[PDB]
């Protein structure tokens, strides 16, 4: 009705704001709305779905992979702000890489095993802070010396 | 574990497992809070930083959040929310009305009229003209909207037998009839559990029979 | 603005946003339900609680916060002091049983985010039943309701999916309230003869208030009629008492299992002997 009855009497945009909320979803704070989003608390003020999701729900996010594709899944830890994902795939809303639905899985058995050798005697060839990919002994000019036993010739890749 | 007991993948001789192919990727923000001894508080409550989180009590989240419980790397993330008070429809507006000083919006008026300059308090007075009018020798605003709606009576909007197998009605009574369809299918809308957006599309519904 | 559009890019949005990995989520959210659901039954076991009950608080919680309350066998109890008892009970209870709560969680939640994706089936197969005799949107809630009753009863244990599982339980809900909802009555008012300001209830005088002879009648009828319906045998008497009056019409079908002669024959003497008592 012409002024519109309660749109005046509530504080209100006497006019759209009750259009749009009554009819649609939209909404208003009642009372305390402690979170975030560039203000605090906005106790009477309006919102579309969108930043209303941006808080019933937060931030989520899906980046699709062609079938072939990962690069830092195991990142399931932590992403930035316009971070790199894949070949194609950014990802500008900031927050946390998580694994979704898996296909490829590495199982790492770790086969034991114990071996001999013979080295230089007296030159310093064995530390125990070496682990792998490191250091075994150094520049003996040469070696050639008896590894006493004998049999069928098998070797490994 | 996959559904047929027919080859599912059992382990073997112990094995670090590592994952390559996703098929998509999520990126929620999120603080991510690691247990590993005993258990928490599970999925979806709110917290900032509440009380007992986590391990029973050496993990405690600061930031203010919704919880999830993840079984798998038994961690919890924390999204960007707590009880934002957030309302929709004519309920959110009740409530606005009960929650409403009256004296308070007249003094407040009266300040608004007076002391600012011209070409503003016009809609103040206007503003005012209804606000004295509620406490006028007049009623309580919470009444502005319904949820009793009387109905006339029958004999009003009536029914008969005109010529034969036509009968004929009040058109009152298809409104009638709209009004109790969408409001009965609601509160059963409500009985079989409550998805949210069919909720309101009911309830917007009922906002339109109504009108 | 106006509602057509409105509800519509309110579910393709959400399903903008989930429109199910057609076999991963799909089946993803229907194990947790079934997860929640079992949860729920020993939780039932180790609380001495109801299934529905527990159901219910679940959903609660989950929700954020909601008036809710409606259960089969009762109608209420008390919702927010109450609820958080019954989550605190759910604290007590060790790793062992925690579990389940945890699991039941994620469940109902998945339940509800499935409902949600699959909205845009319920608005596709209503599309096919528009000018019926309901509105769009009424056929559409009918619809909605359909789908979530599906959802209650999935078992996606056996493999087919849910898209046309579902399609089914929508067609019964809608199908359903077609019947009682939807020459029909005409309305009272119309311009009648010259269309000008008449109204067709102006057209139509009074007859009769008291409409007798119906209570009365009816109240000796049914009784007398029951009186000889008891008084031949229940075979001969029944068979056409419910088959003219009770749901339809047959007597090609008509003998629960004899010769059309019989029933002929029967029928026929039964009459003669119920008239007239020799």
Redesign the interface.
Known sequence: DV?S??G???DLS?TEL?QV????????????????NGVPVEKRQL?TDEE?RE???????????P????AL??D??E?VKGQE?APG?V?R??????????????????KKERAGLRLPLAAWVEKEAYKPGEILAELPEPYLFRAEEEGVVELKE | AA?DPEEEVIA???????????????????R?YPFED??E?????RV?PGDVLADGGKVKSDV???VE?D?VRNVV?V????????????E??Q???KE?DLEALEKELLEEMKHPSRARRA?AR??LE??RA?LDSGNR?EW?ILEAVPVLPPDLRPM?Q?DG???????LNDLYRRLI??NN?L????????????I???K??L??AVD | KI?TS??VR??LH?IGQVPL?TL?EEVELARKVEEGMEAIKKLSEITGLDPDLIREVV?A????????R?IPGLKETLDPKTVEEIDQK??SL??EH??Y???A??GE?A??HL??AN?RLVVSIAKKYTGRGLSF??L???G??GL??AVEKFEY?R?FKFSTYATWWIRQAINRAIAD?A?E?????TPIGDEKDSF??DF?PDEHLPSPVDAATQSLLSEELEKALSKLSEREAMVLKLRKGLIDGEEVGAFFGVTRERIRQIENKALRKLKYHE
Do not use: C, W
């Not at chain 1, 808080?55 to 992979?65: A, F, H, W």
């Not at chain 1, 079938?67 to 990962?70: L, R, W």
């Open positions: 002024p009855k309660i005046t009497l509530l006497a009750e909320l009554y009819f649609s979803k939209y909404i208003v704070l009642d009372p305390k709305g402690a979170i975030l919102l209303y808080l019933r729900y937060g931030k989520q996010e899906t980046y699709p992979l079938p072939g594709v990962d899944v195991k399931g830890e992403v994902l795939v990802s809303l900031d927050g946390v890489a998580l694994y979704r639905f898996p296909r490829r899985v590495r199982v790492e058995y770790v | 559904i073997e001789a112990e094995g670090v497992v590592h994952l390559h192919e996703p098929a998509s990727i999520l990126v929620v923000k999120a991510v005993d258990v508080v599970s999925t979806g409550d900032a203010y959040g919704r419980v079984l993330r999204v960007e929310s707590y009880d934002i008070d957030a309302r929709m429809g004519a959110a507006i409530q606005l009305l409403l809609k206007k503003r209804v606000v509620f605003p502005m008969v005109v197998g036509r009968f004929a009605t009040s058109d369809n969408r299918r509160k059963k809308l409500l009985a079989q559990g409550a998805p949210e957006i069919i309101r599309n009911e917007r519904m906002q339109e | 509602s409105d509800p309110q579910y959400e990995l991963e959903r919680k989950i929700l954020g916060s909601a008036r809710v409606h759910l604290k060790p790793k925690k579990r709560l945890h699991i969680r994620e939640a339940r509800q409902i949600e909205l949107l009424d559409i809630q009918e909605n309701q979530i009753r244990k493999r909802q020459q009555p005409v309305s009272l008012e067709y209830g139509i």
